[PDB]
Scaffold this motif. Structure first.
Motif, PDB file in Angstrom:
ATOM      1  N   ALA A 122       0.823  -1.199   0.000  1.00 19.88           N
ATOM      2  CA  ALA A 122       0.000   0.000   0.000  1.00 19.88           C
ATOM      3  C   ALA A 122       0.859   1.253   0.000  1.00 19.88           C
ATOM      4  O   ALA A 122       0.584   2.213  -0.726  1.00 19.88           O
ATOM      5  CB  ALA A 122      -0.926  -0.013   1.210  1.00 19.88           C
TER       6      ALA A 122
ATOM      7  N   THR B 252       2.015   1.759  -3.300  1.00 15.49           N
ATOM      8  CA  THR B 252       0.982   2.318  -4.153  1.00 15.49           C
ATOM      9  C   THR B 252       0.901   3.812  -3.970  1.00 15.49           C
ATOM     10  O   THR B 252       0.768   4.563  -4.935  1.00 15.49           O
ATOM     11  CB  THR B 252      -0.371   1.709  -3.820  1.00 15.49           C
ATOM     12  N   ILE B 253       0.940   4.256  -2.724  1.00 12.16           N
ATOM     13  CA  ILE B 253       0.735   5.671  -2.480  1.00 12.16           C
ATOM     14  C   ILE B 253       1.905   6.463  -3.029  1.00 12.16           C
ATOM     15  O   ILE B 253       1.722   7.524  -3.636  1.00 12.16           O
ATOM     16  CB  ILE B 253       0.493   5.929  -0.983  1.00 12.16           C
TER      17      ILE B 253
ATOM     18  N   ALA C 188       1.372   6.743  -6.538  1.00 12.56           N
ATOM     19  CA  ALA C 188       0.334   7.720  -6.802  1.00 12.56           C
ATOM     20  C   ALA C 188       0.912   9.119  -6.804  1.00 12.56           C
ATOM     21  O   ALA C 188       0.552   9.951  -7.638  1.00 12.56           O
ATOM     22  CB  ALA C 188      -0.769   7.595  -5.758  1.00 12.56           C
TER      23      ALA C 188
ATOM     24  N   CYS D  42      -6.644   4.949  -4.609  1.00  7.93           N
ATOM     25  CA  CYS D  42      -5.753   5.200  -3.497  1.00  7.93           C
ATOM     26  C   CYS D  42      -6.499   5.818  -2.339  1.00  7.93           C
ATOM     27  O   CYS D  42      -6.190   5.523  -1.187  1.00  7.93           O
ATOM     28  CB  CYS D  42      -4.602   6.101  -3.925  1.00  7.93           C
TER      29      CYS D  42
ATOM     30  N   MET E 183      -7.140  -1.979  -7.497  1.00  7.86           N
ATOM     31  CA  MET E 183      -5.810  -1.390  -7.464  1.00  7.86           C
ATOM     32  C   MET E 183      -5.038  -1.790  -8.701  1.00  7.86           C
ATOM     33  O   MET E 183      -4.523  -0.940  -9.432  1.00  7.86           O
ATOM     34  CB  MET E 183      -5.023  -1.833  -6.237  1.00  7.86           C
TER      35      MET E 183
END
Lengths: 218, 179, 179, 418
Positions: free
Chosen positions: C57, C60-61, C64, C85, C129
């Protein structure tokens, strides 16, 4: 007559199976009378002689015989002139032909089409249809190159996205091109720095100043 | 109430009904943020064309009646005209919805699994059958009518449950749909 | 005796359930001084899965942030990733506390039930996602960020795999007293 | 919603308004004429109101007709992709005539990855694209936007492939596939653009659509073969890992629809899959004992196999009555994913280092483990109590019997038996 017949035997000449049958009528009349083909039906002398290999395999049954009847009482020279004019009528003349299989648009299949080329123009004929699928002149060509397996056919900027031709004898075709493009000549009358490195370095910068920013935020 | 309680002799009682529905759908259009109905793009196009046909033939009928002055036919014609007026208005609103979604940077949505208007209408129909059932001595005719009506509504809601079960996410949710 | 009866006849459900009950009986019986640690290991794997869930995660952020930093069409870049997100960002903390209660208060079974629920809820956004990830893959202008998010998404998919596995381990480990 | 969409509709908004205010003014004229049927200026303004009605009718019609929802963008893609074709053809020239040069900074494998990603997306969305060509234009234009903006980078991938790849006829073939892709793309552009999601368009449109759809399909999986077989040629490829994960996640999502096929048919499918995977994996073990290089094809075929397994397991998972068995099989197949992940991982690791015995120790233990997962799925399908798993096993047995008997009958022909 006989040299066009021989080109027929080649399969280079664009001839319909039906058109082959009328040429077979001419040949049966120049070689025999109407009744001989009426006497006996098998005739590889009617099949093998008159037709190319694909057409004899097509075992032309009696459309050939009907073409004979249509020729009928025409003299030997009569059918000879008929055959000669009929052969001249096709755009086949002055034109070279090469059997090729070409990537058909839309999906990876290879189309059966003939490479019909004259000294001044280039055609495109399907081998199973014997009519020209697409056409060009020598003038339209602005580039060319042949692989051992294919050749590049610049149809000029006007044509969107030329199609190349997949050809075993392509280099011979390219020497033809040299001979072909001869007619246009006759017409004319008298480091420490790397792209990867620099992209890397710009990333490096981007990063370092981001680092300074992050430290300040810290 | 207007219709079978106030006499048609004024006629323009339907005129004001139309004025009402006019303003209603007017605001309805004014904020297009939602679709009136699933009835889609080409469908609403059609709706527009035959609705406009209704308008043209109304243009004929009301005008000739007013030339005559014969109020009843005039009123019926303009009332139907108002009906078509409604019709295309929601048609236009929903075409607005669809093709405003169609904007390249427009972000659509699924708008979920509910079609609350239909369900609620079925709910009130059931409630009305029950209300008819409340009074002791009622004519068998309304009983049978409501019976068939709620039968078809219940069947449709059963279809709704099945559709959700197919389309929803939670397995237990569709289980409870089944039950 | 279960084995012998199965030897009598292979696929009789009676034998299969007999072996079943036998197996969990061996479990329960082991769970005299144990299932302290047996549940604990169930957990151990579980919060493993949770930890890299959150790690992916964080990946991912970060992706992003670079992703939004990139496009010249920064407004309206047609991302499913931004809502993606946001959803996982709101989805993390509960999972975090589930992990925290699991480690801090392990014996309390309800805490692990809670972490189970956090896990199964946390699963759903995984597919979306990776969907936004792959959709964005071409979109980038910095192929470095492309790899960023790419390896991130591989982390994600692997994760969700072991996540669901851990989930099945919980469900077999379930104790139906949650009311 | 998007603002400029509301803006572009403000015309239609206006025309609908004009509907309404024209109706208003016209109906006060109707009131005034209900007062008196013959009022000259009142009749004049009634006619004028009606004319405003008709005018804005035709204006709504004009806006809707010229609306052409999303048509613009398909042709934008058309031209973009035609440019793609042209540069692809320059690549073909510089290759067939041998002048193109790589951007040597980058490496091929990632390029293939990008290929994979984009085509995966396309492949995924074409069927929804087709359904949009059936019903809706809004999402239709949206999707076509995505696929175009994926094509161009995929074109970049194609150009990298051309300029970098070694095997000249073979790279030329790769670009042939690229060309096929683009041809299919333009074709679908047509099909849809005229189709417009209109049920009212004649079935000629329908047809065009579906055969185009297939064309794109075959393009896509032939691409798949090409890329993954390059991966097999590639010594080390974690790409198949991504495929496995795709299998896993799609497995997770499950099919929202109702069962179609017979559960016994699914059972036949799984048993074929499982026997296949088992024989393949043990043969892979043997080759590991012999040599690494062949695992590539082995690995990728395994991957495909797992994909089919999951693919048909989902409708299998929904095709029984006892969902508990379905989720059990689900457990099984996830674990299959994990095991095969380990398998391909270590297979590639060996392909790096064929010398190491520790690698092959890892190989064999992985092989064991995954064999037990195969056994697990075996017992799962057996626990699939439907039909009689013994039926298929006995069919195999009798097939072996006839093999034996054919050997015997040749013995008799030779007379070796006596």
């Amino acid at each position: 007559y006989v040299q066009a017949r021989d080109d027929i035997l080649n399969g280079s000449h664009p001839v319909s199976f039906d058109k082959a049958c009328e040429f077979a009528g001419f040949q049966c009349q120049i070689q025999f009378g109407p009744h001989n083909e009426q006497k006996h039906k098998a005739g590889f002398l009617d099949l093998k002689d008159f037709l190319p290999k694909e057409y004899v395999k097509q075992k032309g049954e009696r459309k050939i015989f009907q073409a004979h009847k249509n020729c009928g009482q025409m003299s030997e020279i009569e059918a000879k002139v008929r055959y000669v004019k009929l052969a001249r009528s096709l755009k086949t003349y002055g034109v070279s032909f090469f059997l090729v299989k070409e990537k058909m648009k839309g999906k990876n299949k290879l189309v059966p089409r003939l490479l019909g080329i004259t000294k001044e123009c280039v055609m495109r004929v399907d081998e199973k249809t014997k009519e020209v699928i697409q056409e060009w002149s020598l003038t339209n060509i602005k580039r060319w190159a042949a692989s051992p397996k294919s050749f590049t056919l610049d149809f000029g900027d006007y044509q969107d996205g030329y199609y190349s031709v997949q050809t075993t004898e392509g280099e011979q075709i390219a020497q033809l091109i040299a001979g072909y493009i001869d007619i246009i000549l006759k017409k004319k009358k008298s480091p420490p720095l790397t792209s990867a490195q620099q992209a890397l370095t710009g990333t490096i910068n981007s990063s370092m100043q981001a680092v300074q920013a992050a430290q300040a935020t810290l | 109430l207007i219709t079978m309680c106030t006499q048609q002799a004024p006629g323009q009682k339907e005129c004001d009904n139309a004025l009402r529905q006019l303003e209603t759908v007017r605001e309805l259009l004014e904020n297009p943020v939602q679709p009136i109905n699933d009835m889609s793009y080409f469908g609403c196009l059609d709706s527009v064309m035959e609705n406009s046909k209704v308008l043209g033939e109304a243009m004929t009928g009301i005008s000739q009646n007013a030339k005559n002055g014969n109020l009843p036919e005039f009123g019926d014609a303009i009332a139907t005209a108002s009906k078509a007026l409604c019709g295309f208005t929601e048609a236009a609103a929903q075409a607005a919805y669809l093709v405003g979604v169609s904007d390249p940077n427009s972000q659509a949505g699924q708008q979920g699994l509910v079609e609350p208007t239909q369900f609620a209408r079925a709910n009130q129909a059931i409630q009305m059958a029950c209300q008819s059932l409340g009074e002791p001595g009622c004519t068998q005719a309304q009983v049978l009518s409501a019976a068939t009506i709620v039968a078809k509504h219940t069947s449709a809601l059963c279809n709704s449950c099945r559709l959700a079960s197919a389309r929803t996410a939670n397995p237990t949710a569709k289980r409870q749909f089944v039950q | 005796e279960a084995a012998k009866g199965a030897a009598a006849h292979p696929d009789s459900e009676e034998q299969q359930q007999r072996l079943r009950e036998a197996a969990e009986g061996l479990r329960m019986a082991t769970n005299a001084a144990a299932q302290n640690a047996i549940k604990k290991k169930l957990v151990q794997r579980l919060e493993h899965a949770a930890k890299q869930a959150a790690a992916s995660a964080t990946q991912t952020i970060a992706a992003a942030q670079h992703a939004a930093s990139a496009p010249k069409a920064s407004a309206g870049p047609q991302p499913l990733l931004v809502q993606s997100c946001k959803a996982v960002a709101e989805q993390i903390p509960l999972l975090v506390q589930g992990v925290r209660g699991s480690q801090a208060q392990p014996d309390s079974p309800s805490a692990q039930l809670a972490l189970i629920a956090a896990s199964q809820s946390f699963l759903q956004p995984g597919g979306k996602m990776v969907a936004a990830a792959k959709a964005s893959v071409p979109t980038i202008q910095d192929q470095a960020s492309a790899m960023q998010l790419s390896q991130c998404a591989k982390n994600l998919g692997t994760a969700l795999a072991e996540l669901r596995t851990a989930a099945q381990k919980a469900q077999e480990a379930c104790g139906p007293l949650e009311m | 919603i998007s603002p400029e969409g509301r803006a572009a509709m403000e015309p239609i908004v206006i025309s609908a308004k004009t509907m309404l205010e024209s109706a208003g003014g016209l109906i006060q004229t109707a009131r005034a004429l209900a007062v008196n049927p013959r009022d000259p200026p009142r009749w004049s303004v009634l006619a004028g109101h009606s004319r405003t009605v008709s005018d804005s009718i035709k204006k709504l019609i004009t806006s809707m007709r010229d609306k052409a929802p999303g048509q613009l963008e398909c042709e934008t893609a058309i031209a973009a992709l035609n440019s793609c074709l042209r540069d692809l053809d320059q690549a073909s020239l510089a290759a067939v005539s041998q002048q193109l040069a790589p951007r040597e900074g980058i490496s091929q494998e990632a390029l293939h990855t990008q290929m994979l990603t984009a085509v995966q997306e396309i492949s995924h969305l074409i069927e929804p694209l087709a359904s949009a060509a059936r019903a809706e234009a809004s999402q239709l234009g949206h999707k076509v936007s995505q696929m175009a903006q994926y094509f161009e980078p995929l074109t970049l991938a194609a150009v990298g492939a051309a300029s970098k790849t070694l095997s000249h006829p073979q790279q030329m073939a790769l670009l042939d596939q690229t060309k096929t892709l683009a041809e299919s793309a333009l074709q679908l552009l047509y099909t849809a653009k005229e189709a417009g999601g209109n049920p009212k368009q004649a079935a000629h449109t329908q047809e065009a659509l579906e055969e185009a759809v297939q064309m794109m399909t075959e393009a896509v999986e032939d691409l798949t073969t090409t890329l993954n077989e390059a991966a097999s040629a590639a010594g080390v490829v974690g790409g198949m890992v991504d495929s496995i994960t795709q299998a896993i996640n799609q497995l997770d999502e499950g099919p929202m629809g109702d069962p179609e096929g017979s559960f016994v048919d699914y059972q036949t499918t799984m048993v074929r899959t499982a026997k296949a995977i088992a024989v393949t994996v043990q043969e892979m073990v043997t080759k590991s004992n012999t040599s690494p290089e062949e695992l590539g094809p082995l690995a990728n075929q395994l991957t495909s196999d797992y994909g089919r397994l999951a693919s048909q397991a989902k409708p299998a998972a929904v095709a029984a009555e006892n969902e508990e068995i379905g989720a059990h099989i689900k457990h099984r197949v996830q674990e299959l994913g994990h095991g095969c992940s380990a398998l391909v991982t270590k297979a590639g690791a060996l392909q790096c280092s064929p010398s190491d015995v520790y690698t092959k120790k890892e190989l064999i233990e992985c092989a064991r483990r995954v064999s037990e997962k195969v056994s697990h799925v075996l017992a799962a399908l057996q626990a699939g109590n439907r039909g009689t798993q013994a039926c298929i096993t006995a069919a195999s047995a009798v097939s072996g019997i006839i093999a034996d008997l054919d050997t015997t009958i040749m013995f008799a022909t030779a007379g070796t038996l006596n």
